[PDB]
Amino acid sequence: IENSHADDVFSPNMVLAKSTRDSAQMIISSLSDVLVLSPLEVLASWYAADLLDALLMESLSRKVEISEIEEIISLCPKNSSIIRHALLAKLVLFPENTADSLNEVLAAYKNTLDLCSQDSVLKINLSKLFTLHSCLSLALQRLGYGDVSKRMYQEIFVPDSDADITPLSFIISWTALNTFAPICTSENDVVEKMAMYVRTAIGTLKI
Amino acid sequence: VLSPLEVLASWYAADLLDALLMESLSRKVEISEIEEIISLCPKNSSIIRHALLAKLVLFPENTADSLNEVLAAYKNTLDLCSQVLKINLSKLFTLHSCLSLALQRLGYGDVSKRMYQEIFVPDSDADITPLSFIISWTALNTFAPICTSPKENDVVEKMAMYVRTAIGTLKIQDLKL
């Protein structure tokens, strides 16, 4: 229970060492939401979280449309945690909207940074590094620079086998493996390592 | 986990490396001096990467072959990092702009400018090392005649105010001695 229970120990936040309490009570990206996010916007961020984790798993069985993502984006809060992941989902799940999408991602990140120094150390784990890593290369293959996007995909550090594996990072790692399964042969280690990442991860209901 | 011999090797290397970066600004620099550095730097340390990022910037025909190692050391520093990252704003910006610089020197232009235009230049704090300065200087140089054209959203202004405060604090930190 992560986005379910873990999302609770965060509802009380209406200062960095404060949140290690969560560990004893039982991911470090949603910790940032305590510095400036209403006690309400915490719970709104929770519902938009669960609403996105459910929307990504339906993107494999059914054909899904942007109207469902913009619902999650407006449902989300101004500058939250899940507002950044929602845009990534948009950048991954819709190639016809990558240029406009890539801007909205890099703007929401150029924004998260400005209101970190002007109010300053980053908190990223390897799984969310690999997540942004792949999501960019996939976004740049779709923009024609694949003469570059291949060589970037070649040097991706892929995590190992563990319980932690949000559906956002799964959908990216899956759709990126597919979009690079043919081009990458000319190194080739990534496709095999990335495909093993997906095969090794499967805690999903038959849909 | 480093012994007591390699800690001094890194301090000695870090001073020579800082010396080579500032010397490269008013003298003609080469790699022959960096080979001596990286070999002097112990085999698995932060100074390795700083010696590499300096080699990436200071040697432009060697971009292709020095970008190889910059990624190798970072994919290797990531390799043992699991078998949680904590990166600084200026560290991000340094890597950010250093890659933008390395890509323009490759022939991406568009991809080089767009990454350059999304650089998040730090405000103006104490995190000013001759390496971060040398990168921002040479990157401002090789990009000021390209990103200055499209007019609307650019960091050219923010980038130049960074190098202002750079040699502001380095020339003044050196003048006290």
UniProtKB/Swiss-Prot annotation, chain B:
Places the protein is found: Endoplasmic reticulum membrane
Phenotype reported upon loss of the gene: Cells fail to grow in the absence of oxygen or sterols.
Induction: Proteolytic processing to mature form is induced by low oxygen or sterols. The processed form binds to its own promoter to promote positive feedback regulation and ensure maximal activation.
Record PTM: In low oxygen or sterol conditions, undergoes proteolytic cleavage by rhomboid-type protease rbd2 and is released as soluble transcription factor from the membrane.
Quaternary assembly: Forms a tight complex with scp1, composed of 4 copies of scp1 and 4 copies of sre1, which protects sre1 precursor from degradation by the proteasome.
Protein's UniProt name: Sterol regulatory element-binding protein 1
